[PDB]
Amino acid sequence: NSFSGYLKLTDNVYIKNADIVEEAKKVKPTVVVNAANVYLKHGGGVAGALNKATNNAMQVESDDYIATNGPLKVGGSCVLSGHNLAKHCLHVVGPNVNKGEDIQLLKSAYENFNQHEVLLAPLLSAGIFGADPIHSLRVCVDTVRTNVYLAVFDKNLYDKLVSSFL
Ligand SMILES: O=C(O)[C@@H]1CCC[C@@H]1c1ccc2cnccc2c1
């Protein structure tokens, strides 16, 4: 495949210090993962950045999805368009520790990735979702079996994740 510059962590997990918006524009992957909430309100973090890169088209599509189907479950996902970034966007809801949600749902959230052979993704529940990114990477490695290319925006966090990886 065309992903370049990644550190191989395991047989199927790869990681890079990169802005997932810029990576998606360069690679045009089959699937880019959004760190969504149950309402698909793409305000900040990964979701706000991906949505802004689509000129708000992701939000317009998402509002129609919710009007038809109602909210997602914490730990659940839906497949929508990837717009100008990817063929598809897999919107995955990891638990938000800053809203008091159960971190055990993080494994269920990563299981959605197994429905796709290859994905470009952020660490679920990390960043503004409040979980420990080292824990998120561990759950990713121990749950996802398909090929996942993780983009970590912050260089300092990337270096901490590599240097602490078991
Ligand atoms: O990758 C990271 O550094 C952390 C870990 C979970 C996602 C979070 C993050 C932070 C800033 C971001 C800016 N722009 C886009 C995506 C972004 C994602």
Walk me through what this model shows:
The relative contact order is 0.21. The strands form two sheets. Strands 1-2-7-6 form a four-stranded mixed β-sheet, with helices on both faces. Strands 3-5-4 form a three-stranded mixed β-sheet, with helices on one face. It has helices at residues 20-27, 45-53, 57-69, 105-111, 133-143, 155-163, and strands at 7-8, 13-17, 31-35, 77-81, 88-92, 118-121, 147-152. The chain is α/β, with parallel strands linked by helices and 166 residues long. It has one domain (7-162): Leucine Aminopeptidase, subunit E, domain 1. A hairpin with a 4-residue loop joins strand 1 and strand 2. It has six helices and seven strands. Helix 4 (105-111) crosses helix 5. Bound molecules: (1R,2S)-2-(isoquinolin-6-yl)cyclopentane-1-carboxylic acid. The site of (1R,2S)-2-(isoquinolin-6-yl)cyclopentane-1-carboxylic acid has 14 residues, from helix 2. Residues 1-166 form the Macro domain. This is Papain-like protease nsp3. It is found in: Host endoplasmic reticulum membrane. It catalyses: Thiol-dependent hydrolysis of ester, thioester, amide, peptide and isopeptide bonds formed by the C-terminal Gly of ubiquitin (a 76-residue protein attached to proteins as an intracellular targeting signal).
